[PDB]
Design a protein around this ligand. Structure first.
Ligand SMILES: NS(=O)(=O)c1c(F)c(F)c(SCCO)c(F)c1NC1CCCCCCC1
Ligand SMILES: [Zn+2]
Length: 263
């Protein structure tokens, strides 16, 4: 059933039920959103984006029950996001992915009505101001998240390191060592983006995120994507259930405006 500790994406515990235990779900700065490009303005004051990523920063991949999570050594500043809308240095913490039960939709953000098959989130936190991820996640300027769309297309070799691990992390709670990960090369060639203030897209739905949603999708094949749907949302010894869909619908803008890095 729905509860604070048992949210998910199934019928009784899914997105439409999260407000029962996390009433910020219906807040003013929730994510994801629909981006209406005719109402987006270019902002010349955005600085160039800076992405410095060290493959050795990756440590572990795990099944959270809600996605896979690649966790990074966030003790140093070897892997950091700077520039764009951001003030100061945002340290890489996590990568995870959202998908739907079928290829036609599953992205979280939706651009002029267009959905993609999946969406990668790359989570960073403001280590110039805050002492930990966990503390940054409660501040409006605390987190910076890159969103990358995945469109069905020819298989993507850059996803192999991830897909090779999925059997080892089938059950919720399993983890496996995962280092030397080339994240940079899972970004599209163009880093043109939209930016707006929003939230985590899972409980606790905290309104602490500067979203940076890249316009250009990367590819994934249907065969590759289907492997993610074979992860379980359930732990060893719990009746099995598959994580066939794990995307939150867009939430209303409720007055926020979205800026473009490009014109
Ligand atoms: N490292 S962590 O487990 O704290 C964590 C991430 F690394 C993340 F990148 C995120 S982003 C959305 C989930 O995938 C996260 F929510 C949490 N968890 C939330 C847990 C509730 C505790 C307070 C802080 C909010 C983050
Ligand atoms: Zn996410």
């Amino acid at each position: 059933m729905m509860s604070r500790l048992s949210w998910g994406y199934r019928e009784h515990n899914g997105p439409i039920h999260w407000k029962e235990f996390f009433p910020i779900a219906d807040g003013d700065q929730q994510s994801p959103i629909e981006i209406k490009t005719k109402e987006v303005k270019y902002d010349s004051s955005l600085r160039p984006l800076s992405i410095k990523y060290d493959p050795s920063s990756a440590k572990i991949i795990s099944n959270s029950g809600h996605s896979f999570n690649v966790d990074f050594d966030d003790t140093e500043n070897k892997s950091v996001l700077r520039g764009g809308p951001l003030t100061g240095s945002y340290r890489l913490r996590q990568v995870h992915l959202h998908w739907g039960s079928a290829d036609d939709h599953g992205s979280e953000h939706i651009v002029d009505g267009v959905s993609y098959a999946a969406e990668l989130h790359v989570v960073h936190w403001n280590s110039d101001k805050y002492p930990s991820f966990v503390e940054a996640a409660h501040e409006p300027d605390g987190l910076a998240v890159l969103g990358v769309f995945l469109q069905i297309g020819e298989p993507n070799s850059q996803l192999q390191k991830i897909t090779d691990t999925l059997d080892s992390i089938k059950e919720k709670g399993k983890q496996t060592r995962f280092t030397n990960f080339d994240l940079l090369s899972l970004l599209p060639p163009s880093w043109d983006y939209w930016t707006y203030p929003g939230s985590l897209t899972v409980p606790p739905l905290l309104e602490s995120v500067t979203w940076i949603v890249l316009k250009q999708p990367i590819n994934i094949s249907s065969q590759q994507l289907a492997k993610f749907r074979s992860l379980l949302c359930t732990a060893e010894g719990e009746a099995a259930a598959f994580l066939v869909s794990n995307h939150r619908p867009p939430q209303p803008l409720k007055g926020r405006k979205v800026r473009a890095s490009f014109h």
